[PDB]
Amino acid sequence: PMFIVNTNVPRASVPDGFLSELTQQLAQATGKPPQYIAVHVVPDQLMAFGGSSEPCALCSLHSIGKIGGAQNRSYSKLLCGLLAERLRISPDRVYINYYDMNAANVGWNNSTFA
Amino acid sequence: PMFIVNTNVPRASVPDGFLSELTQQLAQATGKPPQYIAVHVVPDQLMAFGGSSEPCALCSLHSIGKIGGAQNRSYSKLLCGLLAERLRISPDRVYINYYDMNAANVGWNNSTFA
Amino acid sequence: PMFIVNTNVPRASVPDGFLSELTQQLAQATGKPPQYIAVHVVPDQLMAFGGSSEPCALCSLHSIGKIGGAQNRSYSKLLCGLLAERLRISPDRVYINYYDMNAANVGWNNSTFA
Numbered sequence: 001p002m003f004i005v006n007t008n009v010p011r012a013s014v015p016d017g018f019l020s021e022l023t024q025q026l027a028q029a030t031g032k033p034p035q036y037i038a039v040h041v042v043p044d045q046l047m048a049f050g051g052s053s054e055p056c057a058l059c060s061l062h063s064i065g066k067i068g069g070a071q072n073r074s075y076s077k078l079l080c081g082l083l084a085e086r087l088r089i090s091p092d093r094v095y096i097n098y099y100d101m102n103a104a105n106v107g108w109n110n111s112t113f114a
Numbered sequence: 115p116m117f118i119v120n121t122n123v124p125r126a127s128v129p130d131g132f133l134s135e136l137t138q139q140l141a142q143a144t145g146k147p148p149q150y151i152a153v154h155v156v157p158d159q160l161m162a163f164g165g166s167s168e169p170c171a172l173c174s175l176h177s178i179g180k181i182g183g184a185q186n187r188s189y190s191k192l193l194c195g196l197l198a199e200r201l202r203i204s205p206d207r208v209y210i211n212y213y214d215m216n217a218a219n220v221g222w223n224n225s226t227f228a
Numbered sequence: 229p230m231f232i233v234n235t236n237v238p239r240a241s242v243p244d245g246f247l248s249e250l251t252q253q254l255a256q257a258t259g260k261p262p263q264y265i266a267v268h269v270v271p272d273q274l275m276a277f278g279g280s281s282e283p284c285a286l287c288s289l290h291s292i293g294k295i296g297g298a299q300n301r302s303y304s305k306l307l308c309g310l311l312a313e314r315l316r317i318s319p320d321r322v323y324i325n326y327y328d329m330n331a332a333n334v335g336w337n338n339s340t341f342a
């Protein structure tokens with residue numbers, strides 16, 4: 001699993017523990033060891049959401065499996081909660097695109113997971 | 115709909131009003147209300163297109179529906195036209211990836227759109 | 229084909245010529261002309277892999293075809309090798325997401341491909 005957040009929140013507003021918190025929470029949510037989880041936060045972005053430049057986030061969650069209708073609804077609550085508390089983003093200004101990756105289409109360690 | 119532009123054009127070259135213009139032009143193109151539209155512009159990027167560092171862009175349009183053969187041609191004309199007029203990027207140094215997202219795979223406000 | 233690498237290594241760690249090399253090597257690997265190859269390198273990112281901040285990368289390769297089981301293994305070996313030799317990123321701290329794009333879903337030069 002790989003989680004990416006793109007936001008107009010300033011860099012100084014991103015807590016130093018946020019990547020570790022996300023790692024850990026996503027391990028619990030997906031049932032995967034934290035070692036497998038990658039997280040990426042991109043602050044200071046030129047963005048608008050609904051025509052407004054109030055705090056917002058455009059995010060992606062990729063996983064080989066563990067993606068689906070009910071799971072994604074659950075992830076949205078987890079992730080909106082974390083973004084709300086730690087980045088002070090309203091949950092209605094967050095989009096999360098979910099990608100169920102085929103193992104043959106994820107490279108790692110000189111090969112793929114297939 | 116969510117539109118992202120990644121470009122090597124410098125930040126000072128992005129006009130005031132660009133994000134608003136994109137929002138408005140996308141609302142017209144897609145028929146979706148501007149409240150649901152997100153736009154994200156990322157200048158000053160280390161990029162090459164065709165081995166050259168002349169102005170270029172790599173973009174993405176995600177939408178739940180409103181993606182398809184003729185629609186995407188229309189969008190490419192619109193969006194390359196904006197990049198050319200506003201950012202002075204040649205249309206032949208732009209790629210736009212189009213993604214027709216399943217509503218179950220788009221999270222927003224503590225749920226998905228399914 | 230379009231290749232994007234996001235990394236926590238610093239910009240000064242990216243060697244002169246890296247985007248050229250990537251262009252060249254990807255042309256060789258995909259068989260596509262270099263003119264159509266786009267590369268994008270994003271250093272100095274706020275990242276974690278497995279909860280560690282040691283050098284890592286999150287990458288994407290998009291191509292209209294030339295994506296598949298064996299191909300992707302080959303590309304992973306290539307690209308992990310480059311990131312290791314050039315950017316001193318361990319291969320086991322790189323993920324590469326591969327995307328086989330439908331030509332109708334790729335915009336370029338005011339239109340889309342087929």
Ligand SMILES: *C(=S)NCc1cccnc1
Nearest residue numbers: 001002036037062063064
């Ligand atoms: C998230 S995409 N993790 C990739 C992965 C999956 C299974 C085992 N190891 C890494």
Ligand SMILES: *C(=S)NCc1cccnc1
Nearest residue numbers: 115116150176177178227
């Ligand atoms: C762009 S991805 N807008 C989101 C959306 C689209 C259609 C219906 N509801 C939300």
Ligand SMILES: *C(=S)NCc1cccnc1
Nearest residue numbers: 229230264265290291292
């Ligand atoms: C990479 S996505 N290159 C795009 C492309 C592919 C084939 C022919 N022309 C452009």
